[PDB]
Design a protein around this ligand. Structure first.
Ligand SMILES: Cc1cc2nc3c(=O)[nH]c(=O)nc-3n(C[C@H](O)[C@H](O)[C@H](O)COP(=O)(O)OP(=O)(O)OC[C@H]3O[C@@H](n4cnc5c(N)ncnc54)[C@H](O)[C@@H]3O)c2cc1C
Ligand SMILES: Cc1cc2nc3c(=O)[nH]c(=O)nc-3n(C[C@H](O)[C@H](O)[C@H](O)COP(=O)(O)OP(=O)(O)OC[C@H]3O[C@@H](n4cnc5c(N)ncnc54)[C@H](O)[C@@H]3O)c2cc1C
Lengths: 518, 518
């Protein structure tokens, strides 16, 4: 069902696939029926010709990657690199442009080094959070990792896409240090201290000397990353996870105001996440257990869910790290910041009367333990796919309540339950909207797509721009960053054409196309 | 005395200078006698044709910068951008290539915003640490800045060169967020959230969307930065600076071993700096006050200096930040790490019996107060210039003692006093050598240059590479990063040729030349 990419003959694509099998072995080129796991699991498009991978190649080594790229250049065949291809909600493993060949690097799954005394790992793209965690536990190394939830994905791939987690080390790409890259011309480079032969500092110091370029290979089609370093947090002297609940939907305004100073100054040591009722309820319950109506849940049902589950309309999870005197002092500051809000409640794990419970689950994540759960937002409405919209805004009550109002209104009018959170990294607020939908139903897919377009449009007019998005929306989000007639993308295109003149790496990633396709 | 740059006619250079004065006004083009402050203050070269600026232009605004660059392209005339041009020990304001016109941006000195609730500033390149500090004190804003010592320089220029300071915010470029850049083609771009019109998040979130490119404009000739954001630390709830001295030169091995875990885990909240006797003595004394010999100081004199000044052979300055219970807990951990070393002593300010004193001075710096001092290493030998060599290494005793041994041996054999420190950022050790010399004396200049070359060569063979260097050595340091036949510089050159095909921005910065001069 997948078309050849525009400009590429069937002869060309056939020679390429052939030379690919000479490079990796015939068993490691997939076509035809074996392509289905490279499809987006959470379909949005109703046009079945969109975002369709033609083929996949799975190399064993950096140098194989290089040969493939050289062949790609030779026949004009475009590649879409994935590390493990678990980018669910963002298109999974699927390309922007139909007919692109997937460059699957899952087989390159070596943990090249884990260093306990300097707190780092050097990993290939195939390495999962589960495998890294399991390695560390197995060797008994006193290190924590930082994981998404749910905890599927590549350490490399998630970091390159600017992914996040729930410890002090939650900004994954900020913790990156050193990479090896195959450039679009097939040359291989190492960044930072890795460009110096005989260094023992690749993972100890980011910059090296000269222009700092690691960042240009994140959210990018400027090269293929084959090795990447990441800093790992030493196991702390203590760990106390907490949940603060708030009774009223309006509380999120004053909560955000109080969060701002604690986060700017670092009194809260990890990202602060304040989740709406449904998002946290969906960890241990489904909709049909509280309401049989087709549409979003009414208020009386909300109050029932709150009483059963000991949750609020807003649910703030964070954690304390370090020696008990430190944790005690920080807690005093945090708790005092919220004590005077009517209806507030404060919980540590021992205060949770349920044995299967939101805090108990999130406590795992904020300690860097990768988990899958039986229930999460995906099962709230008995199944479906999801998409997320997570634009950046200032940490103010005004911005938080305005986004909650704007988004919840539209989401509910479209027939979806509102599932949103307010996330704070350091100085950055994100109102994150999660929309679960029936990806098998074309009428729902249309509604979802339309809702998504409108949410982005209306958010952008208030000055809130997206930092990470699905393959289907990459062009749209790029057009948000339109200052001076798209001057920044004009520079990205200049760099693209110099590094990749034949435009063979992931055409359209981050809205970057290349001279032959612009 | 300054030659035209190679390839540029006298006609061409004359038209350019003319059009420059049409752009900025005739009063803001300097030539002839007014060029002398653009010379390197600490001459190394004995060839007086090297590193000589032909002229200087001082624009008032971004858009003037753009016009200049467009004219530079038109006549083939190369520019060397400076923010304030206080890069002393690195060449001052002077270019790598003689005949380059200095683009002096000192007049662009607006503090565009200082935001107390979100802890940031947006500054133009002319803004000094002194001016930023003075602004904040004047408005009574509860923010600290992070300053070099001595505290001259541009907030922008120092950060772009990967400069450092002495608070938790000591990695200046890591604290950068958002910039405006004039590209070598004269187009203007804003990075991150600044590329979205109507954002209020330029200084709140680094990435924006897509490839992260801010880094490529650091230590670079890829564009001219005209505005830059930087995060500022909220004033903490307490501040306790300390000095730990060690009696024996050999102690630095075990000291580095003990520093490693404290720094990796962040128990020490700022950079750790362990300075040799002379470097700290030179803050309050000169050589001739303790020894009249021409050569380096003997051991008996060292012991005299230690007893007078309450200093050791090694002197560790750091500081505690936050609420007293936190500072108390961290101090316990730090002090216990070193208590068992024979001859160790521990001081807070009230324990220093001298009123003019190393700890009292460094206490200012580790609180982000910019200062000049009457005495520092520059006056140790009655005057001269300086150069520094600060390569990266792992935080081990073995690496520290090996570098101390290697460097002190050669430095002393050349007739200089050893002045060195062990600096730790987070995971990175730097043995920093400071060499003070008589920049007026050509025999000393020759010795210094030779010593410098040899120190770099021998360090690099042990796997220790430099991250920041003088204009004279930029090509040399680039050749350190030589893996895969200089593959990283080959990529930098690809980017240079695409962004700057006429090679008019700072030819030779970081060893990056451009097609017309390679
Ligand atoms: C229920 C749910 C919860 C989620 N929770 C989180 C969360 O808490 N935090 C979070 O950050 N994300 C979260 N996500 C998003 C996503 O699932 C994770 O971020 C996941 O870790 C990303 O997949 P990956 O690691 O395999 O990346 P990949 O799919 O391997 O890579 C992502 C993209 O990066 C680029 N890329 C990858 N590898 C390379 C390479 N080697 N060289 C060049 N470019 C490359 C490509 O553009 C690729 O499409 C969630 C998703 C869902 C569905
Ligand atoms: C005694 C002594 C002590 C020192 N102590 C320290 C210290 O503690 N910490 C430290 O970090 N340094 C230190 N230094 C080095 C130096 O003095 C400082 O780093 C100083 O702040 C740098 O000068 P500047 O800020 O004006 O940078 P500039 O000279 O303005 O800029 C430096 C370089 O960056 C580039 N550049 C600058 N601005 C731009 C722009 N807008 N766009 C593009 N490229 C640009 C150019 O390559 C330029 O040559 C010390 C030096 C001496 C002599």
């Amino acid at each position: 069902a997948a078309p050849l990419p525009e400009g590429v003959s069937a002869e060309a694509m056939s020679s390429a696939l052939d030379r690919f099998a000479r490079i990796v072995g015939a068993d490691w080129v997939f076509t035809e029926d074996k392509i289905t796991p490279y499809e987006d699991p959470y379909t949005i498009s109703n046009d079945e010709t969109e975002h369709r991978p033609y083929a996949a190649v799975a190399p064993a080594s950096t140098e194989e990657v290089q040969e493939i790229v050289r062949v790609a250049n030779e026949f004009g065949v475009p590649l879409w690199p994935v590390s493990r291809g678990k980018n669910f909600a963002y298109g999974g493993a699927a390309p922007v442009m139909s007919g692109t060949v997937v460059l699957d690097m899952n087989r390159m799954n070596r943990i090249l080094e884990v260093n306990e005394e300097f707190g780092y790992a050097l990993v290939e793209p195939g390495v999962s959070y589960f495998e890294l965690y399991d390695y560390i536990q197995e060797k008994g190394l006193k290190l924590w990792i930082d994981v998404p939830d749910t905890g599927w994905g590549s350490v490399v791939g998630n970091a390159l896409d600017h992914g996040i987690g729930y410890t002090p080390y939650g900004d994954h790409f900020a913790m990156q240090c050193g990479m090896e890259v195959v450039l679009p011309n097939g040359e291989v480079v190492r960044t930072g201290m890795g460009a110096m032969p005989g260094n023992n500092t690749w993972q100890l110091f980011k910059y090296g000397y000269g222009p700092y370029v690691d960042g240009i290979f994140s959210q990018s089609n400027f090269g293929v990353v084959t090795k990447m370093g990441i800093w790992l947090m030493p196991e702390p002297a203590g760990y106390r996870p907490y949940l603060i609940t708030f009774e009223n939907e309006d509380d999120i305004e004053t909560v955000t105001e109080r969060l701002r100073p604690l986060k700017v100054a670092g009194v809260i040591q990890n990202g602060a996440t304040v989740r709406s009722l449904v998002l946290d309820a969906a960890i241990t319950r489904t909709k049909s257990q509280y309401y049989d109506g087709d549409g979003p849940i009414p208020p009386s049902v909300a109050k029932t869910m709150m009483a059963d589950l000991d949750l609020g309309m807003w649910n703030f999870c964070g954690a304390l790290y370090g020696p008990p005197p430190v944790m005690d002092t920080l807690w005093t500051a945090i708790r005092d910041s919220f004590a005077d809000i009517p209806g507030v409640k404060f919980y540590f794990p021992e205060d949770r009367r349920h044995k299967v419970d939101l805090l108990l689950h999130r406590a795992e994540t904020m300690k860097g333990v990768p988990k899958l759960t039986e229930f999460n937002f995906l099962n709230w409405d008995g199944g479906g796919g999801h998409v997320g919209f997570s634009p950046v805004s200032p940490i103010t009550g005004k911005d938080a309540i305005k986004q909650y109002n704007m988004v919840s209104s539209r989401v509910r009018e479209y027939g979806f339950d509102y599932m949103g959170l307010l996330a704070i990294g350091w100085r950055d607020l994100h109102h994150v909207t999660v929309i679960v939908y029936d990806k098998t139903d074309p009428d729902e897919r249309k509604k979802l797509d339309e809702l998504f377009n409108i949410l982005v449009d209306e958010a952008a007019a208030e000055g809130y721009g997206e930092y990470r998005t699905h393959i289907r929306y990459m062009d749209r989000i790029a057009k948000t960053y339109s200052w001076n007639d798209n001057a920044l993308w004009k520079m990205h295109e200049t760099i693209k054409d110099a590094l990749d003149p034949n435009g063979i790496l992931a055409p359209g990633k981050s809205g970057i196309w290349g001279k032959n396709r612009r």
